[PDB]
């Protein structure tokens, strides 16, 4: 449920590449992997395809 | 629906809170811009239909 994800703090960058933001809940996947790390402000852009 | 035209830009309210006509968290302008350059590959080059 992405309702809680939206209900968390306002996001500086919330960009969806493969899965549409609208269809996030609609689409289903076998496994989900979340990678958590702390990076500087200008390093945010480097985390992208 | 088939053969329809929409030109009005309302800030997309994907979130649970009204956007109030401004951009921000969970508030994105629906319109997005193609960028066309001579060096782009076939498949991203502008095609007139």
């Amino acid at each position: 449920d992405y309702s809680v994800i939206y209900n968390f703090a306002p996001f500086f960058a919330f960009k969806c590449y493969g899965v549409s933001p609208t269809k996030l809940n609609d689409l289903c996947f076998t496994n989900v992997y979340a990678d958590s790390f702390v990076i500087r402000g200008n390093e945010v852009s480097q985390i992208a395809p | 629906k088939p053969f329809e035209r929409d030109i009005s830009t309302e800030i997309y309210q994907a979130g649970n809170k009204p956007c109030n006509g401004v951009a921000g968290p969970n508030c994105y302008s629906p319109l997005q811009s193609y960028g066309f350059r001579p060096t782009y590959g076939v498949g991203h080059q502008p095609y007139r239909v």
Side-chain angles (χ1 to χ4, degrees):
Chain A
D1 190 24
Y2 304 91
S3 179
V4 293
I5 304 191
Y6 303 142
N7 287 336
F8 287 166
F11 297 131
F12 166 68
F14 181 54
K15 186 174 181 179
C16 296
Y17 316 104
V19 183
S20 178
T22 63
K23 302 286 103 176
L24 284 168
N25 277 97
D26 307 64
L27 291 177
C28 298
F29 287 90
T30 302
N31 285 336
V32 178
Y33 276 97
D35 291 344
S36 63
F37 51 88
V38 177
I39 52 169
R40 289 181 295 105
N42 56 3
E43 295 161 345
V44 177
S45 54
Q46 313 184 16
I47 317 291
Chain B
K1 297 301 181 182
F3 272 108
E4 190 171 1
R5 176 186 291 176
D6 187 36
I7 64 169
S8 181
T9 64
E10 292 84 3
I11 310 301
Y12 196 78
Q13 183 180 354
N16 289 337
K17 37 178 180 180
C19 280
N20 289 319
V22 291
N26 267 323
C27 287
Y28 325 116
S29 65
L31 288 190
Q32 193 67 81
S33 47
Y34 302 105
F36 293 131
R37 293 178 179 83
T39 55
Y40 276 31
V42 177
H44 289 96
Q45 264 173 42
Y47 269 81
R48 272 175 180 198
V49 185

